[PDB]
Structure formats: structure tokens, C-alpha cells
Design a protein around this motif. Structure first.
Motif, PDB file in Angstrom:
ATOM      1  N   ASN A  31       0.857  -1.226   0.000  1.00 13.30           N
ATOM      2  CA  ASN A  31       0.000   0.000   0.000  1.00 13.30           C
ATOM      3  C   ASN A  31       0.874   1.250   0.000  1.00 13.30           C
ATOM      4  O   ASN A  31       0.623   2.179  -0.733  1.00 13.30           O
ATOM      5  N   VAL A  32       1.902   1.289   0.805  1.00 13.79           N
ATOM      6  CA  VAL A  32       2.777   2.498   0.811  1.00 13.79           C
ATOM      7  C   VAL A  32       3.068   2.889  -0.634  1.00 13.79           C
ATOM      8  O   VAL A  32       2.779   3.990  -1.065  1.00 13.79           O
ATOM      9  N   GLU A  33       3.590   1.980  -1.406  1.00 11.60           N
ATOM     10  CA  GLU A  33       3.837   2.298  -2.830  1.00 11.60           C
ATOM     11  C   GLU A  33       2.479   2.543  -3.476  1.00 11.60           C
ATOM     12  O   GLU A  33       2.265   3.522  -4.160  1.00 11.60           O
ATOM     13  N   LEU A  34       1.545   1.664  -3.220  1.00  8.59           N
ATOM     14  CA  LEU A  34       0.180   1.837  -3.779  1.00  8.59           C
ATOM     15  C   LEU A  34      -0.356   3.225  -3.421  1.00  8.59           C
ATOM     16  O   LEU A  34      -1.281   3.724  -4.025  1.00  8.59           O
ATOM     17  N   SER A  35       0.224   3.843  -2.428  1.00 13.72           N
ATOM     18  CA  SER A  35      -0.228   5.196  -2.000  1.00 13.72           C
ATOM     19  C   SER A  35       0.493   6.286  -2.805  1.00 13.72           C
ATOM     20  O   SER A  35      -0.036   7.355  -3.034  1.00 13.72           O
ATOM     21  N   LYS A  36       1.710   6.029  -3.211  1.00 16.01           N
ATOM     22  CA  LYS A  36       2.484   7.061  -3.969  1.00 16.01           C
ATOM     23  C   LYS A  36       2.221   7.002  -5.484  1.00 16.01           C
ATOM     24  O   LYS A  36       2.284   8.011  -6.160  1.00 16.01           O
ATOM     25  N   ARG A  37       1.952   5.850  -6.036  1.00 13.87           N
ATOM     26  CA  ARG A  37       1.721   5.783  -7.513  1.00 13.87           C
ATOM     27  C   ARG A  37       0.422   6.473  -7.886  1.00 13.87           C
ATOM     28  O   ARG A  37       0.191   6.825  -9.024  1.00 13.87           O
ATOM     29  N   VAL A  38      -0.421   6.674  -6.935  1.00 10.64           N
ATOM     30  CA  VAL A  38      -1.714   7.353  -7.229  1.00 10.64           C
ATOM     31  C   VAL A  38      -1.679   8.792  -6.717  1.00 10.64           C
ATOM     32  O   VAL A  38      -2.516   9.606  -7.050  1.00 10.64           O
ATOM     33  N   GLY A  39      -0.688   9.114  -5.942  1.00 11.72           N
ATOM     34  CA  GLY A  39      -0.551  10.508  -5.434  1.00 11.72           C
ATOM     35  C   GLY A  39      -1.320  10.702  -4.122  1.00 11.72           C
ATOM     36  O   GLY A  39      -1.927  11.732  -3.904  1.00 11.72           O
ATOM     37  N   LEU A  40      -1.290   9.745  -3.237  1.00 10.49           N
ATOM     38  CA  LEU A  40      -2.015   9.919  -1.940  1.00 10.49           C
ATOM     39  C   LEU A  40      -1.268   9.226  -0.811  1.00 10.49           C
ATOM     40  O   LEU A  40      -0.341   8.472  -1.027  1.00 10.49           O
ATOM     41  N   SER A  41      -1.703   9.440   0.392  1.00 12.20           N
ATOM     42  CA  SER A  41      -1.060   8.749   1.532  1.00 12.20           C
ATOM     43  C   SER A  41      -1.547   7.329   1.529  1.00 12.20           C
ATOM     44  O   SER A  41      -2.561   7.021   0.938  1.00 12.20           O
ATOM     45  N   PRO A  42      -0.799   6.499   2.157  1.00 11.18           N
ATOM     46  CA  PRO A  42      -1.162   5.088   2.185  1.00 11.18           C
ATOM     47  C   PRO A  42      -2.293   4.826   3.175  1.00 11.18           C
ATOM     48  O   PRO A  42      -3.233   4.126   2.863  1.00 11.18           O
ATOM     49  N   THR A  43      -2.229   5.388   4.356  1.00  9.00           N
ATOM     50  CA  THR A  43      -3.327   5.160   5.343  1.00  9.00           C
ATOM     51  C   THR A  43      -4.677   5.193   4.610  1.00  9.00           C
ATOM     52  O   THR A  43      -5.458   4.266   4.708  1.00  9.00           O
ATOM     53  N   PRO A  44      -4.889   6.248   3.870  1.00  5.85           N
ATOM     54  CA  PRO A  44      -6.133   6.383   3.081  1.00  5.85           C
ATOM     55  C   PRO A  44      -6.030   5.561   1.791  1.00  5.85           C
ATOM     56  O   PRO A  44      -6.994   4.954   1.371  1.00  5.85           O
ATOM     57  N   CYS A  45      -4.876   5.517   1.156  1.00  7.53           N
ATOM     58  CA  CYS A  45      -4.763   4.697  -0.089  1.00  7.53           C
ATOM     59  C   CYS A  45      -5.475   3.384   0.158  1.00  7.53           C
ATOM     60  O   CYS A  45      -6.294   2.936  -0.621  1.00  7.53           O
ATOM     61  N   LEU A  46      -5.199   2.795   1.281  1.00 11.13           N
ATOM     62  CA  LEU A  46      -5.887   1.545   1.639  1.00 11.13           C
ATOM     63  C   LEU A  46      -7.363   1.857   1.745  1.00 11.13           C
ATOM     64  O   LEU A  46      -8.178   1.226   1.126  1.00 11.13           O
ATOM     65  N   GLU A  47      -7.711   2.861   2.501  1.00 10.96           N
ATOM     66  CA  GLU A  47      -9.152   3.227   2.603  1.00 10.96           C
ATOM     67  C   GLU A  47      -9.751   3.210   1.195  1.00 10.96           C
ATOM     68  O   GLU A  47     -10.869   2.785   0.976  1.00 10.96           O
ATOM     69  N   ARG A  48      -8.979   3.648   0.233  1.00 11.64           N
ATOM     70  CA  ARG A  48      -9.450   3.646  -1.178  1.00 11.64           C
ATOM     71  C   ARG A  48      -9.448   2.203  -1.696  1.00 11.64           C
ATOM     72  O   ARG A  48     -10.398   1.732  -2.299  1.00 11.64           O
ATOM     73  N   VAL A  49      -8.385   1.493  -1.442  1.00 15.12           N
ATOM     74  CA  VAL A  49      -8.299   0.076  -1.891  1.00 15.12           C
ATOM     75  C   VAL A  49      -9.340  -0.771  -1.150  1.00 15.12           C
ATOM     76  O   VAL A  49      -9.960  -1.652  -1.712  1.00 15.12           O
ATOM     77  N   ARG A  50      -9.534  -0.501   0.107  1.00 16.84           N
ATOM     78  CA  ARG A  50     -10.530  -1.272   0.893  1.00 16.84           C
ATOM     79  C   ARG A  50     -11.873  -1.156   0.206  1.00 16.84           C
ATOM     80  O   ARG A  50     -12.571  -2.126  -0.013  1.00 16.84           O
ATOM     81  N   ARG A  51     -12.214   0.029  -0.183  1.00 21.97           N
ATOM     82  CA  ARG A  51     -13.487   0.224  -0.915  1.00 21.97           C
ATOM     83  C   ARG A  51     -13.476  -0.741  -2.103  1.00 21.97           C
ATOM     84  O   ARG A  51     -14.471  -1.358  -2.431  1.00 21.97           O
ATOM     85  N   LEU A  52     -12.338  -0.888  -2.726  1.00 28.27           N
ATOM     86  CA  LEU A  52     -12.233  -1.831  -3.874  1.00 28.27           C
ATOM     87  C   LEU A  52     -12.260  -3.270  -3.352  1.00 28.27           C
ATOM     88  O   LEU A  52     -12.554  -4.203  -4.072  1.00 28.27           O
ATOM     89  N   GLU A  53     -11.963  -3.448  -2.095  1.00 28.76           N
ATOM     90  CA  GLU A  53     -11.976  -4.813  -1.501  1.00 28.76           C
ATOM     91  C   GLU A  53     -13.419  -5.269  -1.276  1.00 28.76           C
ATOM     92  O   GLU A  53     -13.816  -6.344  -1.682  1.00 28.76           O
ATOM     93  N   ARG A  54     -14.203  -4.454  -0.625  1.00 26.43           N
ATOM     94  CA  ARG A  54     -15.624  -4.824  -0.360  1.00 26.43           C
ATOM     95  C   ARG A  54     -16.325  -5.219  -1.664  1.00 26.43           C
ATOM     96  O   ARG A  54     -17.226  -6.033  -1.671  1.00 26.43           O
ATOM     97  N   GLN A  55     -15.915  -4.655  -2.765  1.00 31.13           N
ATOM     98  CA  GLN A  55     -16.559  -5.008  -4.063  1.00 31.13           C
ATOM     99  C   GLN A  55     -15.917  -6.277  -4.634  1.00 31.13           C
ATOM    100  O   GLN A  55     -16.142  -6.643  -5.770  1.00 31.13           O
ATOM    101  N   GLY A  56     -15.121  -6.950  -3.848  1.00 33.60           N
ATOM    102  CA  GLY A  56     -14.465  -8.198  -4.333  1.00 33.60           C
ATOM    103  C   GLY A  56     -13.508  -7.876  -5.482  1.00 33.60           C
ATOM    104  O   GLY A  56     -13.525  -8.519  -6.513  1.00 33.60           O
TER     105      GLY A  56
END
Length: 66
Positions: A31-56
Motif C-alpha cells: 500500500n505504501v507504494e500503492l499510496s504514492k503511484r496514485v498521489g495519496l497517503s497510504p493510510t487512506p490509499c488503503l481506505e481507497r483500496v478497501r473500498r475496492l476490496e468490499r466489491q471483491g
């Protein structure tokens, strides 16, 4: 034609779709990297990815984020 990361595109935050596009291009990124390739912090990057998680859509990509 490719990618296939549609998911809830009609309603997807720029952070999630770009994160899914980065996970498909990189199925071994946390996620840390997943947070920088999109231009955001990771704490929330996950919050963003988590949203993608609930949708399977993060059971293989950054599913590790859990």
C-alpha cells in the motif's frame, strides 16, 4: 479490449480505479507504494483500496493490505 479493472467505474474514486490499474500492472505491491503511484497517503490509499476490496476486487491485487 484490455485492463478489465472496470469494477464500479461508473462510480469509482480516482484513487481506487488508478489503484486497481496499478495493482493489475503490479500484483506484488503493498500500500505504501500503492499510496504514492496514485498521489495519496497510504493510510487512506488503503481506505481507497478497501473500498475496492468490499466489491471483491482486491482478493488478489493488494488483498495483502489486510
Amino acid at each position: 479490449m484490455v485492463d478489465s479493472k472496470k469494477r464500479p467505474g461508473k462510480d469509482l474514486d480516482r484513487i481506487d480505479r488508478n489503484i486497481l490499474n496499478e495493482l493489475q500492472k503490479d500484483g506484488r505491491i503493498s500500500n505504501v507504494e500503492l499510496s504514492k503511484r496514485v498521489g495519496l497517503s497510504p493510510t487512506p490509499c488503503l481506505e481507497r483500496v478497501r473500498r475496492l476490496e468490499r466489491q471483491g476486487f482486491i482478493q488478489g491485487y493488494t488483498a495483502l493490505l489486510n
